[PDB]
Amino acid sequence: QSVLTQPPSASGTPGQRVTISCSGSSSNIGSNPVNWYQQLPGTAPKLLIYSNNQRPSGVPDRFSGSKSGTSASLAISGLQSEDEADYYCAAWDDSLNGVLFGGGTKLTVLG
Amino acid sequence: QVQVVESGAEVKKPGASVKVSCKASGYAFTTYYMHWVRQAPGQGLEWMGLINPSGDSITYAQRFQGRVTMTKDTSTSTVYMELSSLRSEDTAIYYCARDPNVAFYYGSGNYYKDNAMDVWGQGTTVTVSS
Amino acid sequence: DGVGSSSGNWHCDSQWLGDRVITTSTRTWALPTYNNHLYKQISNSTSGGSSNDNAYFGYSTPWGYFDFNRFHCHFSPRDWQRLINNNWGFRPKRLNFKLFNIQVKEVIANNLTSTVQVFTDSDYQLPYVLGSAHEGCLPPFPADVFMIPQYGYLTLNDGSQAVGRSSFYCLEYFPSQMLRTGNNFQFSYEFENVPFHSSYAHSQSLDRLMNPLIDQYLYYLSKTINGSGQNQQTLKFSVAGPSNMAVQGRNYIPGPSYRQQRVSTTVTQNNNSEFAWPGASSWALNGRNSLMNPGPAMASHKEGEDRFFPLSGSLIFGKQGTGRDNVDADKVMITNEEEIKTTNPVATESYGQVATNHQSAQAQAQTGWVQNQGILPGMVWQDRDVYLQGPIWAKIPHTDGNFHPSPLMGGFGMKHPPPQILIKNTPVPNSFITQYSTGQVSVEIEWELQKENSKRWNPEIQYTSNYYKSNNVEFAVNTEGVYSEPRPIGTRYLTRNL
Amino acid sequence: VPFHSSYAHSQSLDRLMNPLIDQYLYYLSKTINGSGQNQQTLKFSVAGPSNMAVQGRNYIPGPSYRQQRVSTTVTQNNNSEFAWPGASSWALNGRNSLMNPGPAMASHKEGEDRFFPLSGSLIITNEEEIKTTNPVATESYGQVATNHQSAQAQAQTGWVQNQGILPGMVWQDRDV
Amino acid sequence: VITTSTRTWALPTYNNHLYKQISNSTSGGSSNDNAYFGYSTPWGYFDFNRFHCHFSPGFRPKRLNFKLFNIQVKEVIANNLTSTVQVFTDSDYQLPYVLGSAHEGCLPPFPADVFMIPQYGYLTLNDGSQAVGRSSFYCLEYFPSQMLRTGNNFQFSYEFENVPFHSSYAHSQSLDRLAVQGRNYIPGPSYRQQRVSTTVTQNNNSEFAWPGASSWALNGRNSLMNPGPAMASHKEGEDRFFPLSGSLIFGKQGTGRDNVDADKVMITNEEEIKTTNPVATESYGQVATNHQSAQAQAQTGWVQNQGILPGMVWQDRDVYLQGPIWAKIPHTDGNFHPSPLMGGFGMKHPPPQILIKNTPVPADPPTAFNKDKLNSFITQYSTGQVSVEIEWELQ
Amino acid sequence: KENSKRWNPEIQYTSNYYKSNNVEFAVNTEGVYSEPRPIGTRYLTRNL
Amino acid sequence: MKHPPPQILIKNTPVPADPPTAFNKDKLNSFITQYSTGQVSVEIEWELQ
Amino acid sequence: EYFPSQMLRTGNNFQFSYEFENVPFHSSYAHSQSLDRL
Amino acid sequence: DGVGSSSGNWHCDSQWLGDRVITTSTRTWALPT
Amino acid sequence: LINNNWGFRPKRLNFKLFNIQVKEVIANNLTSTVQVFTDS
Amino acid sequence: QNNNSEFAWPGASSWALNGRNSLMNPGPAMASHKEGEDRFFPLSGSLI
């Protein structure tokens, strides 16, 4: 009964801000840290944000992460063509007693 | 540099058992957690199991309990994943991910370990077909 | 007493003394003139009277009335957390009510010689409208000024017409005290003895009460046939024990059931049709169909299903600033009863199966589902939980008979509940000076507690605030000053043995 | 013993509400946006004076065991013998006894004076005074969900022909 | 009546002095209706809850006196004079109460038999074989208890709370003979049982034991309805039929545990109560399912289950020399006719559980201090004498 | 005891609601008692 | 001081404007413009050295 | 508002008294000597 | 007192009285040389 | 404790030692003693 | 995120008594980490 849900798609033009959000149960997003993964086609996922807002070394400042209540959002600013990839929000889920991934959000640049 | 060399692609019939090996080199094998996550060809990521830095404690996703086995070999620095009684839906890519968060945080409220995996293996394509 | 001297002070606080709690609340009210000082017949036909299920007849009155009948009137969110974490049971004991600092206006200036009529109905001679969970209560947050609701009542109807048995009531016919800006009004009330409300959950289930290590000395029928073939009939018997716990004989069976339709919060799992009214559980009274709401107390769902809820089974609260009509499911708060699944059947499930025939050599054993089940001897059940936002008491209807009078929406059933307190402006002359009153109200209720004696080794589940950072504090004002209650809080956290 | 009640209620069990004010409770008003495919939604409305059927109530009517209905206008009755056959009965040690007079219920719906329960009326007395708190003898007690709806199954209900005691019931006894 | 009984007991060491989590997957699991989660304790307990403990071959209990004496502790065989035994009553009813579950391990009916004290265990909330956070764990060491060496004794008294007399008589009048007459009272409630014949050829040739059984469901688990509401076992003239799960069934002396034939068991019958109560295998009666008219014939349907109605009179289930005496009424908001369904006297404060275990006596320590608790112990058991005395009040 | 006037509810120590193979602060199947986490004393609040 | 001179809190009681003649469950946002005035005296006994 | 308070019309008054807890005297003197010249 | 009589009983519980708590703990020990 | 209280502190202490058993290597030694004292 | 060298003893805070160095453990009472950083802990500053 605990789910992670994100919009299947998003869109924006280079330089605009794009926010990607997912909705989670009390057991997962509410009580556990949320991490974000970005996956380009034909390549393994790359960690973007960890521990809700923390950003790993070698990761651009434009990406930003926030957690509010049971909902987690990822913000991308100063958007570029390279940024376009599938985005997954993940969190440990207590009821499941394992890691749970969102369905993924495919971002589409315009041009 | 840190590397996670994923095993070779394979082709299996239903009922067969497939073992995927993950060979790590360039860092301390014992120190980190290792996650297994499968991705169907057109579908999002799905977490399968977890093995702790010591190899003693292992957690599985509920879907996979009893048909999956994970083992860690300190000698050759290799983690293995065992999937049994294969099905058509099993066909996916199997990623091996390293987890740099060693300890639990015990703040007010429920405790938690951050499960963010920085290093990912190239992946292995396992097809279940006749 | 006088114009320039206050007739009462501001009392809001909570005294936690031993096994009792004393809650005190003061608010500011404003009382308009209703119906332009008149009594007016009301019915459905003025609204068109299309639906016979919705038909009604009655009268609206110029009087207003006071409603403190929700728990958040008397308890702060902190004091409620102190109650439900620390106690197995509670119940109201004494009641003290005070009305003071009256101010009458003219439309804006004072009218110093104007009066306010206020009486309480302590013989219960008027229709009792407080147990219907209507809006108009004292606001939860002490700084908010609230409006006094208008009093009205319904009597017997045929369609929109009345009948010879229909009673008309004039509230002027009652003796009432009249107050100017220097007078005040007060009375005390004594709750009749009621059972404690159970603010705990069971750590055992009705079917698991056994010793897991030991066999019973009773036998059950294991086999009706030896094997596959012809004429293999036999009777075999087995000890009931730890291996098979389903077949063991038991002394007590779960409570009654009246089945509700199941609705998922994930909408694509629901059928693509309008089933709200048509697929609803309901009862019929004199040809009119009323929904069964909330209905008998039943577990909202099985464990591992949080998405399903009974269609009319649970109390649903609206969030702060939620619309009136056709709001989305994220605008409302659906309460669930997960703590009674131990003694109570699931609302969306059948009670069980029964044998529908006599088997014989030519006929198989047939069974059928029990969709609704009345009371049977040997049942045990829990009542419905109470909430910070929920009702407190209800008036037991005065009848020849009743069973387990506890009101279905939850709380304390009483044959003599706290009395209706009626209030209106005395008219100052069909042409009348436009006028209204305002003042203060203080209410004081004493609550008896039942302390928790448990020997449980591991820690309890407690109600807690979440630590992680947020734009707003829960149960506080926002930047615009609006007070809100983000979630319903039940009373059941601590556990007891079954 | 208790005083025998020799009075009729001026209120009905379903109309006890204040007609002027809304409840703070909600009900499920609308399960689909409208005509089409994949229209599932959940809308909620306040229970209020306009729709009084859907409001939450603290007490529910008493128990019922349904009687067959007999019209004093003989041509409205079926042309067959069903006095014994169509009778509500109970069984004790393999012997059938007629259910007479039976549980106290209202003899007829409002405005219909020609119908009387086959075995539910002392003989002809009418019980209509108790229809405020008591279900009608010749009507089903209500409806109950007989399944789990889903994308593949429509919601289904069944008629309750007999209903035992439930917590929260209030009823009147038979008059003397 | 005052009955007095004295027996000789032997108390082993359970679980090697350990509390141990037990669950469905510990016993092999695999059945959703059978899943459980709980704990087993090193403690034992005394159960006199059956009548044949107090009786050789209207009434109700009044007072209870308990005594534990002549304690003999043994090491494994010699006497250990310095050892102790711990016993406490649970008089606050703070532990899970297992005495109303009709288990084995009673004081033996024949006064010269020596019996083994059973092991105490309990169940808490499970989901599958797992445990929810609401599941409770009780350590019985966290209760104060009296410690007894070989010369010490233990005694306490108890007062049965006011209960109705159990009826031990049969009605001459049937309810309906006090067909179409008007009557003031109707028979009691029913929940229909499937009818099984003791002539096997008469029964259908299929397996219908569990499938054709009446059951109730709680949180998705199915539990057999056994014995269920008290109902007449068979119609007058037919004694070869019995409700499938509607009656108490006992073993004959030396009856096997699994799949015993029908002559190794003794099937009780309720046939006395058919005066006030319906037959368990019959419908309660008929109800009208429609409105007749010139275009529609009258329709009736069968009542398989009927709840309480105003005007019901019924009898409770009979008690037996082999059967239980009391059960603990579950602590709940509400109940109806709390008399337990297997028979006897339902009580909110039944006779308190009496818990007993041997104090652990460790073996020689390592001589170098070790952080760990000591897992090596002297093999040990105790024996003694129990007397139990109950005052009964006849009617 | 605390006399606190705080309106909104406090933070409390509470055991997890969700299912688990074992009970926190209990024995396992082998009879081993264990303490799953450290529990500090500071939950309720005061003004400074 | 651990227990200094206590805080003294003061506000004007709100007096609502004319309410509507049909009931509404919202809190009242309409008030009479109002202020108060008065006198304050404070007396402290100072011990000297 | 969740604190009890007195309510005053135009003829009412409010008073209370308080006792300063014991504190040391404040020094309002200038030293003639310095710490190094003692 | 003697060999065959216990010199103490088992006391483990807590007692919560007003502004005080009384904790009582009993254990079994083993002392080597 | 920690949910309901702003403070706590120990007041009184009561210590007891009883049910002595002395063993030889296994058999009971009835005449052996155990020494105990406190440094107060 | 830690440096790739051994600093457990070398990077320790400590006090010296009659020539013998003692680790400062747990030391004076101080907050373990800044708000929002749960992954950092003081080397000897915490009880483990």
Check B113 against A101: CB less than 8 A apart: no
**CA-based nearest distance E286→chain C, Å:** 13
Q: How many CB pairs under 8 A join F and J?
A: 21
- Chains touching chain B at 3 or more Cβ pairs under 8 angstroms? A, C, F, K
Nearest chain J alpha carbon to E361: J21
Contact E129, C218 (CB under 8 A): no
E strands of C311-349, at which residues? 316-318, 327-328, 332-334
Least Cα distance to C291 among C323, C320, C314 occurs for C314
Hey, what amino acid is at D159? Answer: W
How far apart (Å, rounded) are the C-alpha atoms in residues C93 and B95?
A: 64
Contact A74, A62 (CB under 8 A): no
Whether A30 has its CB under 8 Å from any CB of chain C: the answer is yes
E strands of I1-33, at which residues? 13-17, 20-24
**CA-based nearest distance C445→chain J, Å:** 23
Resolution (angstroms) equals 2.8
How far apart (Å, rounded) are the C-alpha atoms in residues E188 and E309?
A: 8
Q: Which residues of E32-53 are buried (b: 16+ CB within 10 A; e: fewer)?
A: ebbbbbbbbbbbbbbbbbbbbb
Before C212, cis peptide (omega within 30)? no
Contact D72, D112 (CB under 8 A): no
How far apart (Å, rounded) are the C-alpha atoms in residues C185 and C192?
A: 23
Residues 6 or more apart whose CB falls under 8 angstroms from that of E180 comprise D97, D98, D100, D119
Hey, what amino acid is at C75? Answer: F
Contact A28, A3 (CB under 8 A): no
Residue G12 is encoded by which pair of tokens? Answer: 């004007």
E vs F contact (3+ beta-carbon pairs below 8 A): yes
The three-state secondary structure class of E275 is helix
Which residue is it, tokens 């003796």?
Answer: C175
Residue B17 is encoded by which pair of tokens? Answer: 């058992």
If you ran DSSP here, which 8-state letter would residue J2 be given?
Answer: T
Phi-psi category of residue A97: left, alpha or beta, with phi > 0 → left and psi -120 to 50 → alpha: left
Nearest chain B alpha carbon to A57: B118
Whether E186 has its CB under 8 Å from any CB of chain D: the answer is yes
- CB atoms near residue E75 (< 10 Å): 16
How far apart (Å, rounded) are the C-alpha atoms in residues C158 and C56?
A: 8
How far apart (Å, rounded) are the C-alpha atoms in residues C153 and C169?
A: 9
**CA-based nearest distance I19→chain J, Å:** 9
Least Cα distance to E50 among E96, E110, E120, E121 occurs for E110
Residue to substitute from K1, K5, K39, interface B, most B β-carbons within 10 A: K39
Query: With contacts defined as CB-CB under 8 Å, which chain J residues touch I21?
Result: 1, 8
Give me the DSSP letters along C242-297. TTB-SSS--S-EE--EE---EEESSGGGS-SS--TTTT--EEEETTEEEE--S-S-
**CA-based nearest distance H21→chain F, Å:** 19
The three-state secondary structure class of E37 is strand
Whether F27 has its CB under 8 Å from any CB of chain C: the answer is no
Least Cα distance to E185 among E331, E40, E308, E59 occurs for E308
D vs I contact (3+ beta-carbon pairs below 8 A): no
- CB atoms near residue D141 (< 10 Å): 27
Query: With contacts defined as CB-CB under 8 Å, which chain A residues touch K35?
Result: none
The three-state secondary structure class of B99 is strand
Contact C314, C387 (CB under 8 A): no
The three-state secondary structure class of A26 is helix
How far apart (Å, rounded) are the C-alpha atoms in residues D42 and E101?
A: 46
How far apart (Å, rounded) are the C-alpha atoms in residues C102 and I14?
A: 53
Give the distance from CA E102 to its chain's centroid.
2
Contact D14, C283 (CB under 8 A): no
Which residues on neighbouring strands pair with residue E139, listed in sequence order?
A: none
Check J19 against E378: CB less than 8 A apart: no
The three-state secondary structure class of C167 is coil
How far apart (Å, rounded) are the C-alpha atoms in residues C30 and G28?
A: 9
Phi-psi category of residue D85: left, alpha or beta, with phi > 0 → left and psi -120 to 50 → alpha: alpha
Residues 6 or more apart whose CB falls under 8 angstroms from that of D130 comprise D8, D104, D105, D106, D171, D172, D174, D175
Per-state percent for chain G, helix, strand, coil, to nearest 5: 0, 5, 95
Residue to substitute from E177, E231, E271, E286, interface D, most D β-carbons within 10 A: E286
Contact C443, C96 (CB under 8 A): yes
The three-state secondary structure class of J9 is coil
Structural biology method used = cryo-EM
How far apart (Å, rounded) are the C-alpha atoms in residues C356 and C309?
A: 30
Which residue is it, tokens 């320039």?
Answer: C4
Residue C177 is encoded by which pair of tokens? Answer: 């005290």
Contact F23, E137 (CB under 8 A): yes
Burial of K40 (0-12, 13-18, 19+ CB in 10 A): exposed
Q: Which residues of C360-380 are buried (b: 16+ CB within 10 A; e: fewer)?
A: eeeeebebbbbbbbbbbbbbb
Hey, what amino acid is at C261? Answer: Q
How far apart (Å, rounded) are the C-alpha atoms in residues B95 and C373?
A: 53
Structural element, H or E, at residue B25: strand B18-25
How far apart (Å, rounded) are the C-alpha atoms in residues D62 and D133?
A: 7
Give the distance from CA G47 to its chain's centroid.
33
Query: With contacts defined as CB-CB under 8 Å, which chain C residues touch H5?
Result: 9-10
Q: How many CB pairs under 8 A join E and I?
A: 51
Q: Which residues of C78-90 are buried (b: 16+ CB within 10 A; e: fewer)?
A: bbbbbbbbbbbbb
CB nearest I8 (choices: J8, J16, J34): J16
Nearest chain C alpha carbon to E90: C455
How far apart (Å, rounded) are the C-alpha atoms in residues C383 and C408?
A: 8
Check E220 against C360: CB less than 8 A apart: no
Hey, what amino acid is at D7? Answer: Y
Whether F1 has its CB under 8 Å from any CB of chain H: the answer is no
Give the distance from CA C31 to its chain's centroid.
27
Residues 6 or more apart whose CB falls under 8 angstroms from that of E223 comprise C207, C245, C246, C250, E33, E215, E216, E217
- Chains touching chain E at 3 or more Cβ pairs under 8 angstroms? C, D, F, I, J
Structural element, H or E, at residue D158: strand D157-160
Which residues on neighbouring strands pair with residue A35, listed in sequence order?
A: A90
Query: With contacts defined as CB-CB under 8 Å, which chain G residues touch H25?
Result: 47, 49
CA-CA-CA-CA torsion for C47, C53, C58, C60, nearest 10 degrees? -50
CA-CA-CA-CA torsion for F46, F47, G4, G5, nearest 10 degrees? -110
Query: With contacts defined as CB-CB under 8 Å, which chain C residues touch D6?
Result: none
The three-state secondary structure class of E99 is helix
Residue C362, CA distances (Å) to B82, C234, E389 in order = 53, 16, 55
CB hemisphere CA count around C191 (13 angstroms): 22
CB nearest E21 (choices: F15, F25, F27): F27
If you ran DSSP here, which 8-state letter would residue E53 be given?
Answer: H
CB nearest C4 (choices: H1, H2, H11): H11
Residue to substitute from J1, J2, J3, interface C, most C β-carbons within 10 A: J3
Report phi then psi at C71, rounded to 5: -65, -35
Measure CA of the first residue to CA of the last residue in chain H; give whole Å. Answer: 59
Angle, CA E210 vertex, CA E207 and CA E216 arms, to 5°: 155
Check B44 against A103: CB less than 8 A apart: yes
Contact C384, C410 (CB under 8 A): yes
Burial of E18 (0-12, 13-18, 19+ CB in 10 A): middle
Whether C292 has its CB under 8 Å from any CB of chain D: the answer is yes
Whether E258 has its CB under 8 Å from any CB of chain C: the answer is yes
Residues 6 or more apart whose CB falls under 8 angstroms from that of E373 comprise none
Tell me the torsion sign for CA atoms E58, E60, E63, E64: positive
Structural element, H or E, at residue B52: none
How far apart (Å, rounded) are the C-alpha atoms in residues E139 and E78?
A: 31
Nearest chain I alpha carbon to E140: I12
Count how many residues are written for chain H: 38
Least Cα distance to A72 among A107, A31, A20 occurs for A20
How far apart (Å, rounded) are the C-alpha atoms in residues H1 and E18?
A: 56
Tell me the torsion sign for CA atoms C424, C427, C430, C435: negative
Give me the DSSP letters along C195-243. PPEE--EESS-TT--S-TTS-BSBEEEEEEESSSSSS-EEEEEEE-BTT
Before D49, cis peptide (omega within 30)? no
Contact D147, D167 (CB under 8 A): no
Measure CA of the first residue to CA of the last residue in chain C; give whole Å. Answer: 58
Burial of C54 (0-12, 13-18, 19+ CB in 10 A): middle
Q: How many CB pairs under 8 A join D and G?
A: 3
If you ran DSSP here, which 8-state letter would residue C138 be given?
Answer: P
Note the helical H segments in E213-319: none
Whether E27 has its CB under 8 Å from any CB of chain F: the answer is no
Give me the DSSP letters along E105-120. -PPPSSTT-EEEPPEE
How far apart (Å, rounded) are the C-alpha atoms in residues E250 and C217?
A: 7
Check K39 against A51: CB less than 8 A apart: yes
The three-state secondary structure class of G26 is coil
Give me the DSSP letters along C339-386. SSTTTS-BTTS--EEEE-S--BTTB---EEEESEE---TTEEE-----
Contact C219, E196 (CB under 8 A): no
Hey, what amino acid is at C117? Answer: Q
CB hemisphere CA count around D52 (13 angstroms): 26
Check C305 against A1: CB less than 8 A apart: yes
Residue A21 is encoded by which pair of tokens? Answer: 């959000």
Which residues on neighbouring strands pair with residue B95, listed in sequence order?
A: B37
Residues 6 or more apart whose CB falls under 8 angstroms from that of A5 comprise A22, A23, A24, A102, A103
Check C466 against B109: CB less than 8 A apart: yes
E strands of chain A, at which residues? 4-5, 9-12, 18-24, 34-39, 46-49, 64-68, 71-76, 86-93, 98-101, 105-109
Structural element, H or E, at residue C81: helix C77-86
Residues 6 or more apart whose CB falls under 8 angstroms from that of J27 comprise none
Angle, CA A61 vertex, CA A59 and CA A63 arms, to 5°: 80
Query: With contacts defined as CB-CB under 8 Å, which chain E residues touch J24?
Result: none
How far apart (Å, rounded) are the C-alpha atoms in residues B59 and B68?
A: 10
Count how many residues are written for chain K: 48
Whether E350 has its CB under 8 Å from any CB of chain D: the answer is no
Whether E93 has its CB under 8 Å from any CB of chain C: the answer is yes
**CA-based nearest distance J5→chain C, Å:** 11
Least Cα distance to C412 among C227, C266, C198, C211 occurs for C198
How far apart (Å, rounded) are the C-alpha atoms in residues E99 and E78?
A: 34
Report phi then psi at H9, rounded to 5: -85, -170
Before E227, cis peptide (omega within 30)? yes
Measure CA of the first residue to CA of the last residue in chain J; give whole Å. Answer: 30
Whether F34 has its CB under 8 Å from any CB of chain E: the answer is no
Contact G14, C103 (CB under 8 A): no
Which residue is it, tokens 């709401």?
Answer: C293
The three-state secondary structure class of C451 is strand
If you ran DSSP here, which 8-state letter would residue A54 be given?
Answer: B
Q: Which residues of E158-191 are buried (b: 16+ CB within 10 A; e: fewer)?
A: bebeebeebbeeeeeebbbeeeeeebeebbbbbb
Count how many residues are written for chain J: 40
Which residue is it, tokens 């009434």?
Answer: E59
How far apart (Å, rounded) are the C-alpha atoms in residues D131 and E382?
A: 70
Q: How many CB pairs under 8 A join A and K?
A: 4
Residue A5, CA distances (Å) to A9, A35, E192, J17 in order = 12, 14, 48, 62
Query: With contacts defined as CB-CB under 8 Å, which chain D residues touch E303?
Result: 161-162
Nearest chain F alpha carbon to E132: F19
Check B95 against A103: CB less than 8 A apart: no
